[PDB]
Amino acid sequence: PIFLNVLEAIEPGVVCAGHDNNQPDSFAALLSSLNELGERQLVHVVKWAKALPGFRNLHVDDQMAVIQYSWMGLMVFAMGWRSFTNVNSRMLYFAPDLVFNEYRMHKSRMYSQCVRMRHLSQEFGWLQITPQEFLCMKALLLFSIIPVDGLKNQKFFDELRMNYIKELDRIIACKRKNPTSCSRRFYQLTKLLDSVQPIARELHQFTFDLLIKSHMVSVDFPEMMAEIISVQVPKILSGKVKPIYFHT
Ligand SMILES: Cc1c(N2C(=O)[C@@H]3[C@H](O)CCN3C2=O)ccc(C#N)c1Cl
């Protein structure tokens, strides 16, 4: 398949967080690094998204927005998958140097949101998600959140999102599936995508509050990341931009 050649051909590489595992595990130590990973992962997502099939049909002022609104979720999705394939959903494999043990889950103060992220990671296993299904879902994921008043050129956006929903269905369907089998895996796969949204929302809020009190707690925020968290994220939380759920 052509569409799959590119998806796999573009899948990023091992991005390291550049954490100092030697020094102890302070809350600040963790997040100042998580944030740094955010930053690093952000860049790759841009190069990934931009080199996506038909991605350039979007309006210039829509390409950037689509990516920034969707980066947490995307970072979450892939991260869940790394965890799965690597530590087998036992811990959260943020990066090779930033792997989360139960201790870290609690020291980051994100224990719970992490329970959630690890939960999603387990679905790849439980549901037996396929690398081909993962890649397709990840891509669609990007086209899963937009402003209520629509983008600059909504028509291109939706057209693009339609072609993606179909690539997903084209992959899930091509084996022992038929009727109840096809109209069951699609429900779950789309049910799995919807779940990343709630998690991203809670991560958004955490990060956002974290940026405001930033100094009070001595947590590091990169130029790039901080902007998004102050300009695009507020827009999500206030309601200006909302996710796109297949269900409910
Ligand atoms: C989710 C997340 C974050 N992440 C974020 O970007 C926000 C802020 O960094 C604060 C908490 N939170 C995170 O852990 C950073 C990097 C990666 C990767 N790889 C992921 Cl999956």
UniProtKB/Swiss-Prot annotation:
Positions of the UniProt region annotated as Interaction with KAT7: 1-248
Alphabetized UniProt keyword annotations: Cytoplasm, Disease variant, DNA-binding, Isopeptide bond, Lipid-binding, Lipoprotein, Metal-binding, Nucleus, Palmitate, Phosphoprotein, Receptor, Steroid-binding, Transcription, Transcription regulation, Ubl conjugation, Zinc, Zinc-finger
Positions bearing the Glycyl lysine isopeptide (Lys-Gly) (interchain with G-Cter in ubiquitin) cross-link: 175, 177
PTM characteristics: Phosphorylated in prostate cancer cells in response to several growth factors including EGF. Phosphorylation is induced by c-Src kinase (CSK). Phosphorylation by TNK2 enhances the DNA-binding and transcriptional activity. Phosphorylation by PAK6 leads to AR-mediated transcription inhibition. Ubiquitinated. Deubiquitinated by USP26. 'Lys-6' and 'Lys-27'-linked polyubiquitination by RNF6 modulates AR transcriptional activity and specificity.
Annotated tissue distribution: Highest levels in the seminal vesicle, ventral prostate and coagulating gland with lower levels in the kidney and levator ani muscle.
CC per GO annotation: axon; chromatin; cytoplasm; cytosol; dendrite; nuclear matrix; nuclear speck; nucleus
Disease tied to this entry: Defects in Ar are a cause of androgen insensitivity. Rats with this syndrome are called testicular feminized (TFM).
Known function: Steroid hormone receptors are ligand-activated transcription factors that regulate eukaryotic gene expression and affect cellular proliferation and differentiation in target tissues. Transcription factor activity is modulated by bound coactivator and corepressor proteins like ZBTB7A that recruits NCOR1 and NCOR2 to the androgen response elements/ARE on target genes, negatively regulating androgen receptor signaling and androgen-induced cell proliferation. Transcription activation is also down-regulated by NR0B2. Activated, but not phosphorylated, by HIPK3 and ZIPK/DAPK3.
Name of the protein: Androgen receptor
Source species of the chain: Rattus norvegicus (Rat)
Full-sequence range covered: 654 to 901 of 902
